[PDB]
Amino acid sequence: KVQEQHRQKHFEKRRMPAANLIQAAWRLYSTDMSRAYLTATWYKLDDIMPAVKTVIRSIRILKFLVAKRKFKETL
């Protein structure tokens, strides 16, 4: 039973990094489709300087890469 109770606790140690990976992946995915960017402000902002949204995407990729590593470090 103790062999059945300590593999839960280590499996619980992956729950948070697994959630962080899913959240960082979705937030990266939503950068190109979310209603948050479907406003007249973001369309004009994306027209006069498309570098702003690309920078925001570059940051989210960097955060997805960190989250993927921390999740793999719990294997």
Binding site: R15, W26, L28, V55, L62, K68
Partner: protein, 145 residues
């Protein structure tokens, strides 16, 4: 495989970070741009983000490393496997499904919790059918374009 124009788009984004124009992105330049947008990363978070793409070891990001990161995004083999492995941690059935209620519960209570509107946009992006289960396998194929 990248057009010369979308390389110039990534160059424009790189130049936004590279304020001094020395061809590298330091933690100083990465964090300054992030905090101009309202984000507040710690110094350690800036080092972890840079070290994920720093293939040289000097602690900076050059343009070729920036190009590969922006081109790959999540479309790599390792990302699809790991995101799939993350979804399986919350799938005690092992059949490749997770209920919409449990997924909503995990996203809004673990790690960097999603807002109510964020998780609502995620659940709408994944078609539920029948009892309320969402094939998270189809979900990771969608996120990884």
């Amino acid at each position: 495989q990248l057009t010369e124009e979308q390389i110039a788009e990534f160059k424009e984004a790189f130049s936004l970070f590279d304020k001094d124009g020395d061809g590298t992105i330091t933690t100083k330049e990465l964090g300054t741009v992030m905090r101009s947008l309202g984000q507040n990363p710690t110094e350690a978070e800036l080092q972890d983000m840079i070290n994920e793409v720093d293939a040289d070891g000097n602690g900076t990001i050059d343009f070729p490393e920036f190009l590969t990161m922006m081109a790959r995004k999540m479309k790599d083999t390792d990302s699809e496997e790991e995101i799939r492995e993350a979804f399986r941690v919350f799938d005690k059935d092992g059949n490749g499904y997770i209920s919409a209620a449990e997924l909503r519960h995990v996203m809004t209570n673990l790690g960097e919790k999603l807002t109510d509107e964020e998780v609502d946009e995620m659940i709408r992006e994944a078609d539920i059918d029948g009892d309320g289960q969402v094939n998270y396998e189809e979900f990771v194929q969608m996120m990884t374009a």
